[PDB]
């Protein structure tokens, strides 16, 4: 009768596959699948969908605490990454290659000798602590450490435990990948791994250039900052405020709040034309929708976000 | 950290190594600020050190809300708008006694309408049945 | 299509709120999930005192194995009731607050 | 490609990053001595390029952690805007509105790919008209 559970129980029909452990043997949701989340919802390890608004509301809504994973930064729960150590004076962690290298690396000098507080970069602790892999000097004494792939166990500070170095901030230009091996990166289509870590752009694309407003006029320059070309000079005491570009049509769009107009030009110059000249009294910013060829703009005289064709 | 000079002169050489001027407050590893921004009402500091735990000194020209959150101008006390968050500025305000008018005002005999005292005996019948221009009104020349 | 006293008022308050037809249509499909959480919580609320009496009866019997086995099931059953208690309260607060804000102007 | 959003602050003087859902907040630069008044920002490969009204220059910083942002074209005015122009900065995808304007009478505007039952677009109406019951035909507002 009803849904016979994995261990013989009359579980209700609605209970199976509702993102929850209902069966006594944890087998009430194995045989089905669950639909994915709409863009107005967010994910959990339960296969569940939760409201966008619940994320970082402070509530453990989905068992992982996953919708509350680090809603805050520069904070007390450091639990610092492999080959790192914390100077007691502040909420700061510094790599072992810096800690007690002879130069103050924590700004307060909390990683070098401080005789006034009776602290020296000692190494005697390793003799009795008997580190598993290696030891290093700290103001406390000889601190035990273990190789990349692993962190010092917090129970004893003498053992070391397997780790997900994919967590280090600055690991990769996209993702960690080639995992089960400790860590390196992988880069998406159109990128190549120069040096390791670096997702360098493919040679098949034109040279990257930065276009920007120097305050009055639109300028163009390469990534190395060796060349600077004026793309378009402002007329009638104008001011280039917000710039954006469309690649496929090779056009550059910018706004002029002093002239209260929006302009568009070709990347090499010429074909300069006004795009909007009514109710555009203060076009604070700009963004093009290259897939649908739309121009999202921000207006601040009457606070709104408008959409127009290119 | 603000370009008040419009040339960036005032913010030049302002490294983290240094102190605030004697007449400035310090935000923890963020910026120095005018003491005018200390207890201005809003947090200028990254961690709100400028607004931390200080108390209001609302003046006689101002009224302090019951919740003690903020002070408002004396003009806004008893006006018919809830300027305070807890509606304390409109709590305990005067009213007309039932069916009657303030010691100030004049009352229309026709329908009990309260009108300004000056509108009794000013030549114009400001009342529905001319109560405010009765025979006892001494005329003006 | 509602039975819970809590959900019935929320739907009545929803029809007088600022909800767009699309928002109101999606609101009903959320109340259906909200009711399922309540009925699941209500079902386990009966089970908590049912097993509580079962645990009390077994503790009177005095068998250490039956007492240990029933206690192991009981403390896990209590967690099931307690965790659903907040699941229902959090959903109730969000639904009540949203319709409160949509009616407040 | 990382599904992250970078924003800058002119008042608390930081550059920070969160995922598209707001989780996993991290700081890439902060303090009045580093980012006194950032206004515009853009990024390419491993670098973030931002303009600042106080140093009056476009800056280069690492997208992860920058101890001291390098200068780039120091200017005599407030630099108001910056963006990197490259092909990989505009990835390549199929627009739902490409199919005969998505059947919309006047305007076809994108949405989230799951929205509108997986169509990923909604029809919009110009100022002089309103959207009808079928959410496809535009009729004059009354
Ligand atoms: C989104 O989709 C579009 C369309 O498919 C892609 O656009 C293509 O991008 C590739 C990559 O750069 C282009 O390939 C290059 O084409 C050049 C010539 O094409 C231009 O000129 C012809 C006319 O002569 C036009 O028909 C064409 O539309 C282009 O305007 C070649 O010169 C390039 O090769 C050169 O460099 C390589 C080294 O990199 C050398 O080995 C070669 O010998 C040669 O010197 C190259 O083949 C392609 O042309 C683009 N097509 C269009 C229509 O734009 C977007 O890139 C894509 N975006 C992404 C990132 O997905
Ligand atoms: C706005 O810009 C469009 C071009 O995209 C332009 O056609 C509009 O009208 C033009 O305005 C000019 C300046 O007022 C005017 O000299 C010109 O004759 C006129 N062109 C036509 C045929 O309409 C622009 N509008 C405004 C008011 O600037
Ligand atoms: C030791 O540390 C591990 C984490 O590495 C922790 O799970 C465990 O509870 C600790 N205690 C013992 C003695 O295992
Ligand atoms: C103003 O209010 C403060 C509140 O801290 C109080 O200490 C002080 O005596 C008052 N008088 C003045 C004008 O300082
Ligand atoms: C998952 O389900 C959602 C429901 O809104 C969408 O249909 C989405 O498109 C599905 N996922 C994929 C990968 O198609
Ligand atoms: C702190 O720095 C300020 C910067 O205006 C002055 O140089 C001041 O003399 C300094 N005070 C001390 C004690 O170093
Ligand atoms: C208003 O003031 C009168 C005195 O003129 C009375 O105190 C009256 O009770 C007040 N109104 C209310 C609502 O209490
Ligand atoms: C009218 O007012 C004038 C003002 O100059 C004189 O006071 C005059 O005597 C008044 N008339 C009467 C009848 O009192
Ligand atoms: Ca289940
Ligand atoms: Ca939450
Ligand atoms: Ca050091
Ligand atoms: Ca302040
Ligand atoms: Ca008032
Ligand atoms: Ca009168
Ligand atoms: Ca500032």
């Amino acid at each position: 009768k009803e849904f016979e559970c994995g261990s013989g129980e009359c579980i209700l029909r609605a209970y199976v596959c509702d993102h929850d452990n209902d069966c006594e043997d944890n087998s009430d949701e194995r045989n089905c699948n669950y639909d994915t989340c709409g863009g107005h919802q967010f994910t959990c390890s339960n296969g569940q969908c939760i409201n966008q608004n619940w994320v970082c509301d402070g509530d453990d809504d989905c068992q992982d605490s996953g919708d509350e994973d680090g809603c805050e930064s520069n904070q007390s729960h450091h639990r610092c990454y492999p080959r790192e150590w914390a100077c007691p004076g502040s909420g700061r962690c510094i790599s072992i290659d810096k800690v007690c290298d002879g130069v103050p690396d924590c700004p307060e000098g909390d990683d070098e000798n401080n005789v006034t507080s009776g602290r020296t970069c000692g190494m005697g602790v390793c003799s009795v602590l008997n580190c598993e892999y290696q030891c290093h000097q700290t103001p406390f004494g000889g601190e035990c450490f273990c190789p990349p792939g692993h962190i010092i166990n917090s129970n004893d500070s003498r053992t070391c435990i397997d780790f997900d170095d994919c967590q280090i901030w600055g690991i990769c230009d996209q993702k960690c990948e080639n995992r089960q091996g400790r860590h390196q990166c992988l880069c998406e289509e159109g990128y190549i791994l120069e040096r390791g870590q670096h997702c360098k752009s493919s040679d098949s694309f034109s040279a990257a250039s930065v276009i920007f407003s120097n305050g009055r006029d639109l300028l163009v320059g390469d990534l190395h900052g060796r060349n600077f070309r004026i793309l378009a000079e402002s007329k009638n005491r104008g001011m280039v405020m917000g710039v954006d570009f469309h690649y496929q049509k090779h056009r550059v769009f910018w706004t002029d709040p002093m002239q209260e107009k929006v302009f568009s030009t070709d990347i090499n110059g010429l074909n300069t034309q006004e795009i909007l000249n009514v109710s555009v009294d203060t076009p604070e910013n700009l963004a093009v929708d290259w897939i649908n060829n739309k121009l999202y703009l921000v207006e601040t005289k009457v606070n709104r976000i408008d959409v127009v064709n290119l | 950290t603000d370009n008040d000079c419009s040339d960036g002169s005032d913010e030049k050489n302002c490294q983290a190594s240094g102190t605030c001027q004697p007449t400035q407050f310090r935000c923890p590893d963020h910026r120095c600020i005018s003491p005018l921004y200390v207890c201005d009402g809003d947090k200028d500091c990254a961690d709100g050190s400028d607004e931390a735990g200080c108390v209001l000194n609302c003046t006689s020209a101002q009224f302090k809300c019951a919740d003690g959150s903020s002070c408002i101008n004396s003009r806004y006390r008893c006006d018919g708008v809830y300027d305070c968050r807890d509606n304390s500025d409109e709590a305990g305000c005067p009213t007309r006694p039932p069916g009657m008018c303030h010691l100030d005002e004049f009352q229309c005999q026709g329908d009990g309408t309260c009108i300004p005292n000056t509108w009794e005996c000013d030549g114009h019948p400001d009342c529905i049945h001319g109560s405010d221009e009765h025979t006892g009104c001494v005329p003006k020349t | 299509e509602f039975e819970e006293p809590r959900v019935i008022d929320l739907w009545d308050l929803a029809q007088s709120a600022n909800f767009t037809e699309k928002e109101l249509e999606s609101f009903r499909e959320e109340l259906k999930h909200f009711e399922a959480k309540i009925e699941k919580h209500n079902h386990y609320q009966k089970q908590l005192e049912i097993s509580h009496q079962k645990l009390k009866h077994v503790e009177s019997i005095g068998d250490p194995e039956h007492i240990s086995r029933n206690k192991e099931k009981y403390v896990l059953l209590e967690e099931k009731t307690k965790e659903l208690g907040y699941k229902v309260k959090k959903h109730l607060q969000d639904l009540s607050s949203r319709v409160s804000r949509a009616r407040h102007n | 490609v990382s599904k992250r959003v970078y924003w800058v602050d002119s008042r608390y003087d930081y550059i920070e990053t969160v995922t598209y859902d707001g989780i996993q907040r991290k700081t890439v630069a902060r303090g009045g001595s580093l980012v006194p008044h950032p206004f515009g920002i853009s990024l390419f490969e491993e670098h973030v390029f931002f303009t600042d009204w106080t140093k009056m220059a476009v800056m280069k910083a690492s997208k992860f952690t920058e101890t001291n942002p390098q200068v780039y074209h120091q200017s005599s005015l407030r630099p108001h805007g910056v963006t990197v122009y490259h092909a990989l900065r505009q990835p390549n995808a199929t627009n739902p509105c490409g199919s005969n304007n998505g059947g919309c009478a006047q305007v076809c505007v994108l949405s989230h790919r799951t929205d509108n039952g997986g169509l990923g677009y909604r029809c919009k109406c110009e100022f002089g008209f309103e959207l009808d019951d079928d959410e496809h035909r535009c009729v004059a507002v009354k």
Side-chain angles (χ1 to χ4, degrees):
Chain A
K1 190 63 179 76
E2 263 59 80
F3 181 87
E4 298 281 4
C5 171
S7 292
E9 212 280 337
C10 296
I11 292 292
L12 289 168
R13 270 61 170 249
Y15 284 174
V16 299
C17 289
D18 69 343
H19 321 96
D20 192 21
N21 181 42
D22 310 353
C23 264
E24 62 191 303
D25 56 7
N26 188 239
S27 197
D28 63 302
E29 313 215 330
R30 204 70 61 198
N31 307 88
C32 82
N33 57 50
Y34 326 87
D35 292 354
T36 82
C37 311
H40 59 298
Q41 296 166 333
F42 179 68
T43 295
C44 327
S45 77
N46 322 300
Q48 179 169 322
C49 304
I50 47 166
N51 299 353
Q52 66 191 145
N53 299 303
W54 285 2
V55 186
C56 288
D57 73 1
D59 302 331
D60 189 359
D61 295 310
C62 224
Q63 306 198 108
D64 300 329
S65 189
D67 67 302
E68 269 73 24
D69 192 353
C71 308
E72 65 191 356
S73 61
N74 206 348
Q75 79 282 17
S76 300
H77 301 288
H78 304 289
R79 196 185 176 182
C80 303
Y81 309 81
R83 257 47 176 92
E84 298 191 345
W85 167 94
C87 33
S90 63
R92 177 74 71 86
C93 257
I94 303 296
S95 62
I96 67 99
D97 284 309
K98 294 293 182 181
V99 172
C100 281
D101 66 346
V103 179
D105 296 316
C106 301
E108 325 87 352
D110 207 23
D111 78 299
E112 294 299 332
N113 57 288
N114 180 12
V115 180
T116 50
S117 302
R119 302 307 197 97
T120 58
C121 286
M123 268 162 276
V125 170
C126 327
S127 63
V128 176
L129 201 55
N130 289 185
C131 309
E132 188 174 321
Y133 183 70
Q134 301 304 13
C135 206
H136 205 282
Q137 43 170 318
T138 61
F140 286 94
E143 186 74 359
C144 299
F145 292 107
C146 55
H150 332 78
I151 62 166
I152 287 291
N153 195 54
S154 61
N155 309 352
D156 43 282
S157 78
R158 192 268 313 141
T159 56
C160 174
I161 56 177
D162 200 14
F163 196 66
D164 190 24
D165 306 42
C166 300
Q167 294 193 356
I168 85 170
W169 181 234
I171 184 53
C172 290
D173 294 6
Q174 258 115 92
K175 312 174 307 205
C176 86
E177 251 293 2
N178 306 3
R179 189 51 191 181
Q180 103 169 229
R182 269 67 177 209
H183 50 286
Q184 75 145 71
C185 312
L186 182 143
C187 307
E188 301 311 329
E189 308 318 317
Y191 294 106
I192 63 178
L193 283 79
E194 176 184 306
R195 187 166 54 261
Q197 300 185 269
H198 183 184
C199 296
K200 188 63 160 70
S201 49
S202 171
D203 179 21
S204 60
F205 298 110
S206 190
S209 61
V210 184
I211 74 186
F212 64 94
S213 172
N214 69 340
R216 197 202 308 106
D217 308 315
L218 216 174
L219 274 73
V220 180
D222 36 6
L223 288 178
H224 299 295
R226 265 57 170 182
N227 293 165
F228 286 102
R229 170 173 58 108
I230 288 170
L231 172 58
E233 65 178 317
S234 291
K235 308 309 183 61
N236 327 310
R237 310 183 83 256
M239 165 206 256
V240 175
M241 147 66 61
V243 302
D244 203 62
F245 71 104
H246 188 109
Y247 192 77
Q248 303 282 57
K249 291 178 170 60
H250 55 78
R251 293 202 72 77
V252 177
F253 303 82
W254 84 91
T255 69
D256 192 339
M258 293 292 312
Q259 293 189 92
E260 307 185 22
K261 286 182 282 186
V262 178
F263 293 92
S264 178
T265 181
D266 184 17
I267 181 60
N268 67 84
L270 307 180
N271 296 5
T272 313
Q273 68 207 38
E274 289 154 45
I275 299 307
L276 287 175
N277 41 36
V278 290
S279 195
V280 165
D281 310 279
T282 319
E284 190 80 334
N285 224 326
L286 208 65
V288 306
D289 181 51
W290 55 90
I291 296 301
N292 207 42
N293 304 273
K294 297 293 181 174
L295 176 63
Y296 288 64
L297 55 99
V298 167
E299 213 286 287
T300 50
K301 183 74 81 68
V302 177
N303 301 300
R304 60 196 138 121
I305 291 158
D306 279 6
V307 166
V308 293
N309 277 358
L310 294 184
Chain B
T1 75
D2 303 339
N3 189 359
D4 308 45
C5 288
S6 187
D7 204 49
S9 321
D10 43 331
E11 309 314 299
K12 195 175 63 176
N13 304 340
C14 299
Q15 258 290 10
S17 186
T19 58
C20 299
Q21 296 177 109
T23 50
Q24 282 170 327
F25 181 78
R26 183 177 167 266
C27 288
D29 70 308
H30 170 37
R31 64 197 287 216
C32 299
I33 28 170
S34 314
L36 277 63
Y37 302 168
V38 180
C39 312
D40 52 9
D42 61 286
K43 315 193 169 59
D44 297 281
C45 264
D47 55 354
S49 295
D50 54 313
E51 305 308 296
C54 75
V55 181
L56 295 163
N57 186 283
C58 325
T59 168
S60 180
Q62 291 166 192
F63 169 111
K64 49 216 61 204
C65 310
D67 61 353
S69 61
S70 67
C71 336
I72 40 60
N73 186 281
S74 183
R75 258 178 303 86
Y76 300 144
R77 170 55 168 162
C78 302
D79 59 7
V81 176
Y82 308 118
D83 302 284
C84 287
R85 197 143 28 80
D86 54 355
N87 315 71
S88 86
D89 56 312
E90 301 308 301
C93 290
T95 66
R96 289 174 182 116
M100 288 175 278
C101 306
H102 295 86
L103 280 300
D104 172 33
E105 295 175 310
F106 180 86
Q107 185 164 47
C108 268
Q109 292 262 322
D111 61 352
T113 303
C114 305
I115 70 178
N117 190 55
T118 309
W119 293 16
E120 148 70 320
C121 271
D122 62 344
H124 184 60
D126 304 298
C127 190
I128 178 174
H129 279 286
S131 316
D132 65 310
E133 299 299 333
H134 57 77
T135 192
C137 195
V138 179
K140 179 173 181 180
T141 90
Chain C
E1 189 207 283
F2 289 125
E3 161 62 357
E4 251 303 288
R6 288 199 273 291
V7 178
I8 285 165
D9 56 56
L10 290 196
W11 183 245
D12 282 15
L13 267 60
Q15 294 271 160
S16 79
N18 267 274
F19 286 156
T20 287
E21 173 53 38
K22 292 171 183 176
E23 288 210 321
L24 178 67
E25 167 220 2
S26 77
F27 192 80
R28 214 191 64 102
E29 288 136 346
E30 165 139 16
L31 286 184
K32 293 206 280 306
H33 294 321
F34 177 49
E35 185 176 59
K37 219 75 81 178
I38 291 160
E39 307 215 296
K40 189 176 197 183
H41 188 203
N42 289 345
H43 180 62
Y44 287 121
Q45 282 182 315
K46 297 177 182 179
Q47 300 200 240
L48 184 60
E49 78 190 0
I50 274 298
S51 181
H52 216 197
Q53 286 164 102
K54 286 191 175 180
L55 180 66
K56 286 177 178 181
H57 293 319
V58 163
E59 281 182 338
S60 78
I61 293 161
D63 194 336
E65 283 208 52
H66 294 318
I67 287 167
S68 194
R69 288 167 190 280
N70 285 26
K71 182 173 181 179
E72 287 154 41
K73 309 154 80 55
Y74 175 80
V75 313
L76 293 207
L77 202 180
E78 165 65 299
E79 177 266 15
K80 210 67 198 187
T81 37
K82 176 49 218 59
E83 194 233 337
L84 253 287
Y86 181 66
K87 202 88 64 170
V88 161
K89 182 208 301 152
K90 166 58 184 282
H91 217 157
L92 177 55
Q93 187 42 291
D94 182 52
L95 281 166
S96 322
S97 62
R98 279 158 60 187
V99 81
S100 301
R101 190 177 180 180
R103 289 175 74 238
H104 194 73
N105 90 73
Chain D
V1 63
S2 310
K3 301 303 183 199
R4 302 186 78 83
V5 55
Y6 285 71
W7 83 95
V8 307
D9 190 274
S10 317
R11 198 187 195 170
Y12 298 161
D13 293 6
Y14 61 65
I15 305 184
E16 277 177 18
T17 321
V18 293
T19 325
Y20 282 8
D21 303 278
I23 71 163
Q24 298 187 248
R25 190 165 180 177
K26 297 189 182 297
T27 181
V28 313
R30 57 169 280 107
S33 49
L34 268 66
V35 278
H37 197 118
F39 186 85
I41 181 163
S42 188
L43 72 85
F44 186 72
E45 292 183 14
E46 88 280 42
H47 288 295
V48 140
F49 291 84
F50 64 88
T51 64
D52 153 38
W53 283 7
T54 296
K55 288 172 173 288
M56 282 134 85
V58 185
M59 242 68 72
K60 192 189 294 183
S62 172
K63 75 154 57 163
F64 314 113
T65 286
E66 189 54 65
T67 178
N68 183 21
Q70 311 296 340
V71 80
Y72 180 101
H73 188 75
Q74 191 152 228
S75 178
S76 59
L77 292 104
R78 320 290 226 290
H80 292 301
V82 59
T83 199
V84 181
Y85 187 118
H86 189 271
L88 290 169
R89 196 87 276 273
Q90 287 189 336
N92 256 2
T94 293
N95 64 320
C97 291
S99 298
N100 65 277
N101 199 28
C104 305
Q106 297 190 348
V107 184
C108 193
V109 175
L110 287 194
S111 200
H112 196 277
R113 290 291 161 142
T114 71
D115 194 33
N116 201 10
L119 284 175
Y121 72 91
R122 315 295 298 217
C123 302
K124 289 297 173 181
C125 212
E126 297 176 45
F127 283 116
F129 313 85
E130 73 179 0
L131 214 72
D132 206 4
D133 179 57
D134 53 24
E135 36 174 2
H136 271 249
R137 305 202 331 283
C138 268
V139 306
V141 72
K142 44 181 57 52

